[PDB]
Amino acid sequence: TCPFYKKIPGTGFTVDAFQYGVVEGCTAYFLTHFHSDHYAGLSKHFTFPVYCSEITGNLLKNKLHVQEQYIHPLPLDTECIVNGVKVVLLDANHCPGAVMILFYLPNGTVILHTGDFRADPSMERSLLADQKVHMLYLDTTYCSPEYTFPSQQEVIRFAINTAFEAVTLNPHALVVCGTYSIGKEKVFLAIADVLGSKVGMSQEKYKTLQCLNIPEINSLITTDMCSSLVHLLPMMQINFKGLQSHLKKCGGKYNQILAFRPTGWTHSNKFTRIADVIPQTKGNISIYGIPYSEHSSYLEMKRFVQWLKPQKIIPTVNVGTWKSRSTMEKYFREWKLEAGY
Ligand SMILES: CN1CCN(C(=O)Nc2ccc(F)cc2)CC1
Numbered sequence: 048t049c050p051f052y053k054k055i056p057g058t059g060f061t062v063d064a065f066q067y068g069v070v071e072g073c074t075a076y077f078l079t080h081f082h083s084d085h086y087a088g089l090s091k092h093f094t095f096p097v098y099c100s101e102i103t104g105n106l107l108k109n110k111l112h113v114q115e116q117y118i119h120p121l122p123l124d125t126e127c128i129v130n131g132v133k134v135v136l137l138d139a140n141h142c143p144g145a146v147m148i149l150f151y152l153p154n155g156t157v158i159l160h161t162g163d164f165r166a167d168p169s170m171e172r173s174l175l176a177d178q179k180v181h182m183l184y185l186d187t188t189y190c191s192p193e194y195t196f197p198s199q200q201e202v203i204r205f206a207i208n209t210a211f212e213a214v215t216l217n218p219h220a221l222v223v224c225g226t227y228s229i230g231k232e233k234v235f236l237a238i239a240d241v242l243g244s245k246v247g248m249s250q251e252k253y254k255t256l257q258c259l260n261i262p263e264i265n266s267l268i269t270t271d272m273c274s275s276l277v278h279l280l281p282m283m284q285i286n287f288k289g290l291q292s293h294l295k296k297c298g299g300k301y302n303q304i305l306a307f308r309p310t311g312w313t314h315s316n317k318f319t320r321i322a323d324v325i326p327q328t329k330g331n332i333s334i335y336g337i338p339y340s341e342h343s344s345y346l347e348m349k350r351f352v353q354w355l356k357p358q359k360i361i362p363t364v365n366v367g368t369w370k371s372r373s374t375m376e377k378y379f380r381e382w383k384l385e386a387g388y
């Protein structure tokens with residue numbers, strides 16, 4: 048059964064609610080982004096209206112084979128009427144196609160649902176600048192002050208400089224990057240660009256990337272592994288055993304692997320600056336864990352909420368324990384008292 052924080056009151060709408068069968072009273076199902084915890088349940092057999100971005104719609108059609116007649120893509124930054132209710136989709140600064148949704152309820156209430164997001168000051172000059180938001184359904188993934196990490200730009204600078212140094216010292220080194228979902232494409236694209244290579248990958252991953260509206264993508268990716276010195280593999284294979292096995296398959300073209308695992312936050316963020324990060328090494332294989340986040344840091348989240356000044360906050364992540372719920376509620380009260388709303 049569908050939980051309360053996935054229902055939008057007085058609209059007939061649910062958000063990211065495809066794993067509960069037919070939800071009583073739901074006339075339209077919104078999907079914020081194409082990550083499996085959120086799309087869980089969609090297939091070629093779904094026959095209710097789905098509202099989403101153009102990119103999410105491309106993935107629904109081609110990867111999950113949802114029929115075209117049920118996919119309703121909406122442009123960003125544009126007032127749209129859906130089943131008698133005004134809505135707006137805004138970029139969430141998460142993975143490709145990820146949106147936040149603004150709902151203008153018939154009674155005058157205004158709700159913002161962030162989906163998954165990485166809060167940024169640029170959001171303070173979207174269509175949010177205008178009007179009051181009464182209720183905020185908030186991505187609280189990293190809602191605790193211990194969660195610090197660098198900007199995406201600083202992490203990409205580190206990865207580019209590391210890869211370029213290694214391959215210039217050894218032109219027979221292979222670079223490998225882990226993936227298990229869409230998002231974080233800049234990691235492998237930036238490294239391939241500095242090295243003058245296309246990114247090599249499976250047919251299945253190539254298909255997924257072709258759905259994303261990335262400019263000049265045919266120039267950047269390929270299924271021909273032999274032509275490429277940046278390879279993508281499943282995240283599960285980014286370990287000494289799996290990389291040893293991959294190196295065997297490359298027919299003596301390479302004699303070294305440099306690999307990257309883009310994680311979220313890890314406990315080594317409490318001790319180590321991005322500049323100081325070192326790999327794990329065994330023989331001719333080195334593995335770097337890099338803290339590339341597509342979710343708000345604690346400080347980014349706090350700044351956005353203190354700017355927005357919502358009347359009520361409904362968390363959508365870490366909702367399953369009393370300890371987590373009490374911790375989040377204490378932070379929301381601190382933020383409100385400090386800022387005066
Ligand atoms: C006192 N009620 C609370 C629930 N409520 C509502 O509208 N629920 C809902 C159901 C299904 C859906 F899709 C969306 C919302 C508002 C009035």
Ligand code: NI
Nearest residue numbers: 080082141163
């Ligand atoms: Ni996500």
